[PDB]
């Protein structure tokens, strides 16, 4: 997260850390007691998932195994598009004060929506934080996203950020949540390199387009 701050502890209780050999490579989002959304580009054959965390280095936190996951069937067709997967935890987690699922937005993004993105990806100073970071970003129009991310803009994507304040997601934030008006709207997916350029929003998986696929998978 570029130009954010430490989140208030446990204020994003759906945040999931995806780690391999105790090293973070992505985040995810707890959407039901047994289900974590993440970016399809975070796919692995198995996962250790940190829940209820603030630091990666805390009563109620859990490390859980997940042995099953499924990428959206059209991931990367076309390139970078449809960037979501569902991870099924090997055991359901009983909701607690610090581990809680978040609902997916019933509305699709529109310009001006106010959002929050969180994660343990790179900071503005190029370091990896130990404490979960949070920053505010606003949705921009589809036409802005299309123009900026020509030739690869696809309706499975939307853009948020791009202010002169240089607030953005960055490497290591993929799969983590973008909460707009209090609902899960997007997952961190991709953006321009470098992250945090003036005027340049990041790109997020457009979850309102996938609620049927997500819930059909959950219920199967």
């Amino acid at each position: 997260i570029i130009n954010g701050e430490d989140c208030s502890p446990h204020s994003q209780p759906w945040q999931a850390a995806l780690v391999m050999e105790n090293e973070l490579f992505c985040s995810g989002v707890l959407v039901h007691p047994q289900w974590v959304l993440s970016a399809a580009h975070c796919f692995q054959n198995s996962y250790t998932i940190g829940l209820g965390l603030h630091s990666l280095e805390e009563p109620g936190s859990q490390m859980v195994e997940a042995s099953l996951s499924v990428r959206h069937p059209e991931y990367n067709r076309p390139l970078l598009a449809n960037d979501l997967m569902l991870i099924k935890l090997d055991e359901s987690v009983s909701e607690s004060d610090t581990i809680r699922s978040i609902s997916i937005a019933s509305q699709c993004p529109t310009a001006g929506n106010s959002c929050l993105v969180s994660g343990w990806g790179l900071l503005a100073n190029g370091r990896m934080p130990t404490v979960l970071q949070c920053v505010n970003v606003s949705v921009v129009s589809e036409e802005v996203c299309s123009k900026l991310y020509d030739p690869l803009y696809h309706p499975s994507m939307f853009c948020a950020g791009g202010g002169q304040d240089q607030k953005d997601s960055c490497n290591g934030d993929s799969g983590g949540p973008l909460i707009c008006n209090g609902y899960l709207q997007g997952l961190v997916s991709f953006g321009k390199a470098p992250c945090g350029q003036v005027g340049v929003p990041g790109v997020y998986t457009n979850l309102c387009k996938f609620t049927e696929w997500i819930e059909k998978t959950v219920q199967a």
């Binding site: 960037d83 490497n171 953006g191 390199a193």
Partner: peptide, 11 residues
């Protein structure tokens, strides 16, 4: 270019 936050597109 663009990069997943990984595949990059050169542009």
């Amino acid at each position: 270019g663009f990069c997943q936050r990984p595949i990059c597109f050169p542009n």
